[PDB]
Design a protein around this ligand. Structure first.
Ligand SMILES: [Zn+2]
Ligand SMILES: [Zn+2]
Ligand SMILES: [Zn+2]
Ligand SMILES: [Zn+2]
Lengths: 410, 411
């Protein structure tokens, strides 16, 4: 491998404004993404890969064909070309700190700083080459570190003539708005299983995510002139506060970690006549997920007791996505090769649940079981995002090894 | 008096669509109000009143000149020409119920009903002449009953040659949406005191109203992806829920009545990042009013206690109006004459509070003390609105007598 060429590749992708935007019917949601998609398409062709197709919805697929004879299962690696809408992805001006000495890093010239007081991980990254922002923007290691790594891995397999079956690659348009799997043509991708290279620090591997549902509450109250309100007026907001009061305050995103699920009130709007509440429900375990739904319904009936026919509480519950675990563990080889790969590269696998949704978790329920491989990056979606070059080198080495190890079993 | 003419006159105003509209910059808010305003203007000229003016904003003013010599104070009578947005005021279909015999009244061809089980005051109005809706609209007794009573009083004052001083009359445009006194030219109206004819059942007199202030609470939280929220996320909506738990639940519009004040959450909107609460404070007492302002502060400091500087709770209190009591009672003759008149008319005066604001309330602070007088109407702002013809005649008698008794106290 070649650490300079890897960094340069990455810095070129990072330089392109490819930030997503919510509330957009078109996919991809923004123009900038097409520029990275198209650069990537040319790069894949130029790398020698075949069947390079960019769909009309911004999904880019390509194949590095089998190296050796034998019936090796086709595997995929997936990244997205967009950065989070939460912070600018435009004119990212990366800072390169060689041989990091475990102190505060100044982001640009200003009162913005990357500091181990705020981010203790840094204590553990002494002597690594850190790539940071300048305080004004995101970095976009999420997920262009992923892209640079997949691209480099492709090159390595060829230049180092490492035996491998068919390797499939896809680069998706709107992950940061959850549209990164919608138009994914799994038949065309033609892989048995896959990996998104879209995780965090060195060694992270993820095959679990939340089960999700929205719980939307419509409350109809009765509103008259407040002065004559006695024994007549029914305040929808007062019922709304009653509902919220019964919801386990300790089982909230603020107070919850690791594998522990939560209820969460995301938005609300109302008057005396009508209020609407938007809850989300999250649980890794499915029975609990359902138990959580049951709770909201119990709260709705309790609070609803006493209301004259003209007043009522109405709950609409709607599943959003499921825990991919089952569809992954269904096939021991997927996580076993991934972990063997890491272990071969002297990486200790760090199993970690996705406290949310991933592209892979959708793909998993589409015929394409798809866990998450690390990237080397930290502090995503903010101005304190960074990445180590060495983290990225290890992520290449793992993709390559997975490819290699898959060939041995075919 | 001719109850025939009074009824006919009332029904003529009733037929005119003059429903008001909220959140409109122009005053009046609707075209229909101009039709009633102009009708009345011509009518007032035709009654021999002087100085009839109709301003570019829809306030109509006129004067019936002093009947007799003397230093008699000018007094006013005010009613509003609009009806509530709450129910339709278009093509009202009044039903005349003669010699009310005490049952339910069928409203139109359907299943809407005016019933003494729903409104027990009906047990008190047997034998009287009821005028109801057809169930499909408002009636508009509020306040077209008052307009009809004022106009008739002016006629009685003249036809019977009853001694009176200057009688000021006015008809305002946007009362049911808060603008009724916004463009009231007090100097030009030129009355020492007035009465709105916009009360309810026979005998009602009102000189006390709520003190009002809005309390607007701004909550700045901190939003992140819920999955990684621990120790970081601060739910603005959670903080709002905490403030609401602190506000005395029993001291709310749903639980209050008579002279007792309240806190009320009218509306609210928010996400994790930001929430805004819109409270209102009502109290008849000035001190208790301020105490309620202080409790909202007590609450906001407490719920915000512990928050990191990125998050906060920001209160903004703003007075909307005040109790007219001090401005009215300052001149004992205003209520005295009003009360005497009703007694001269065999009506027992009934003083009750306005659980809100009136045009008079604002006027009382613009240099025109202005209590509220009954109309004979009930169940205002809805399809169960009714009035009795005899109640309206009593209101005319009270108006004439107030004018009459004012002329006796030339001082
Ligand atoms: Zn990502
Ligand atoms: Zn991301
Ligand atoms: Zn009125
Ligand atoms: Zn009214």
């Amino acid at each position: 491998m070649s650490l300079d060429k890897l960094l340069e590749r990455f810095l070129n992708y990072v330089s392109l404004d490819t930030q997503s935007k919510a509330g957009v019917r078109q996919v991809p949601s923004t123009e900038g993404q097409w520029k990275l998609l198209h650069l990537l398409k040319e790069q894949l062709e130029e790398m020698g890969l075949i069947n390079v197709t960019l769909s009309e919805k911004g999904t880019l697929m390509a194949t590095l064909p089998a190296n050796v004879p034998g019936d090796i299962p086709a595997i995929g690696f997936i990244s997205h070309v967009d950065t989070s809408p939460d912070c600018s992805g435009k004119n990212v001006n990366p800072q390169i700190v060689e041989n990091y000495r475990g102190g505060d890093i100044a982001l640009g010239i200003g009162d913005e700083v990357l500091s181990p007081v705020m981010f203790p991980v840094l204590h553990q990254l002494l002597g690594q080459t850190l790539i940071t922002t300048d305080g004004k923007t995101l970095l976009g290691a999420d997920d262009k570190a992923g892209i640079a790594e997949i691209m480099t891995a492709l090159a390595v397999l060829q230049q180092k003539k490492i035996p491998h079956g068919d390797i499939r690659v896809a680069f998706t348009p709107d992950e940061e708005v959850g549209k990164g799997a919608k138009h994914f043509d799994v038949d065309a991708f033609d892989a048995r299983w896959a990996y998104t290279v879209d995780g965090g620090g060195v060694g992270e591997l993820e095959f679990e995510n939340f089960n999700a549902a929205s719980v939307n509450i419509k409350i109809v109250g009765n509103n008259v002139h407040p002065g004559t309100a006695k024994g007549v007026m029914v305040n929808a907001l007062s019922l709304a506060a009653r509902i919220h009061a019964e919801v386990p305050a300790d089982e909230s995103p603020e107070m919850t970690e690791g594998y522990e699920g939560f209820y969460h009130l995301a938005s609300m709007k109302g008057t005396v006549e009508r209020a609407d509440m938007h809850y989300i429900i999250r649980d890794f375990d499915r029975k609990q997920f359902e138990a959580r739904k049951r709770k909201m319904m119990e709260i709705a009936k309790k609070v609803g007791k006493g209301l004259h026919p003209d007043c009522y509480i109405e709950l609409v519950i709607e599943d959003s996505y499921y825990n991919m675990r089952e569809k992954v563990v269904e096939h021991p080889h997927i996580l076993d090769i991934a972990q063997q790969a890491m272990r071969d590269c002297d990486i200790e696998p760090e199993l970690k649940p996705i406290r949310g949704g991933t592209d892979g978790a959708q793909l998993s329920f589409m015929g394409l079981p798809c866990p998450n491989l690390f990237t080397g990056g930290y502090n995503y979606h903010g101005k304190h995002e960074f990445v180590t070059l060495e983290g990225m080198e290890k992520a290449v080495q793992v993709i390559v090894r997975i490819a290699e190890l898959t060939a041995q079993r075919k």
